[PDB]
């Protein structure tokens, strides 16, 4: 599946940046990530990682539910990706317009820690901690959060999540503007 | 020393500052902490972590060493900062205008993770791994060094470190354009 995901990338990639009349290197400045790995994502020869695909889908101002598309139901499917696996993302409710949201239930393993890159200018995040210990990062400092403790913030900044227990499960609200 | 600590951040900073002819407001817009944090930290209110260090060092186009100009001697005796206890720094060579350079040696402890926002334009770090196993993040990926092991890369990029056994010493070169 870790082929089938790549070229699931590759060909939405694409079409995402093809049906904005964008050429490669546009891209490459909106979202931060070289040419040349935007080239090869494109191509299938490099396996992008969840944090990459959250830069793409920031500089290009789509959501990441836009990276499937071509065909929703891979969604719901799609909860193990090959460059995370301490990390398991369950879609509940793939982006809507009317209301700007994306939910997901995210799975951390063996005490991962993930950091990211801001999201869009606006992008604001809900988090709800289900089960275990876990911290997540934004105003230059760690928040740590217990089972049904809860929390948001603005995420066009570096951000990130971490489970201080070896497990730990939570929803995560991304609010896009509207 | 948590509340001396405060003091020479606080002092310098403003220092550093006010040598530039910059408001609050400005300087927040170039590091990217808010004017509300700055103020705080100016007022000994807030104890800043290394990372926040490195973001307004970087908005300011300063070096790290800079933050201790006010009694250099300090700097030599700075290992472990409040915010930071798993992360221990030994400066064997502050900041030096004719060569770029200011060079650390880092320890980092409990496998701890330590992710940076970028450095100024243009800046360009060295490591060489002096003991244990650690990864090094940046082109959206890790790269995973043993003892001995070297690498080098540009930082004015979102990365970090990470000693992926408990313990880790790396030599860090921190080289400034010219
Ligand atoms: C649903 S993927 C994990 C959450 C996403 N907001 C991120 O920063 O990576
Ligand atoms: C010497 S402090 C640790 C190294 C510094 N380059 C950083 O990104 O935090
Ligand atoms: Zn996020
Ligand atoms: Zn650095």
Chains 1, 2 share one sequence.
Request: avoid cysteine; aromatic fraction near 10%.
């Amino acid at each position: 599946t870790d082929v089938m995901f790549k070229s699931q990338i590759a060909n939405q990639l694409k079409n995402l940046r093809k049906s904005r009349g964008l050429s490669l290197d546009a891209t490459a400045q909106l979202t931060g990530v070289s040419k040349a790995m935007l080239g090869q994502i494109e191509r299938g020869e490099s396996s992008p990682t969840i944090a990459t695909l959250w830069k793409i889908a920031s500089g290009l101002e789509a959501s990441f539910s836009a990276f499937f598309a071509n065909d929703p139901q891979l969604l719901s499917s799609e909860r193990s990706f090959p460059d995370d696996l301490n990390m398991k993302i369950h879609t509940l409710f793939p982006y809507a317009a009317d209301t700007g949201l994306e939910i997901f239930e995210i799975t951390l393993l063996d005490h991962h820690q993930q950091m990211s890159s801001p999201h869009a200018l606006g992008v604001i995040e809900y988090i709800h901690v289900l089960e275990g210990i876990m911290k997540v990062f934004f105003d230059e400092q760690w928040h740590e959060l217990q089972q049904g403790e809860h929390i948001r913030f603005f995420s066009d900044q570096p951000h990130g999540y971490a489970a201080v227990t070896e497990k730990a499960v939570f929803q995560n609200i991304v609010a896009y503007p509207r």
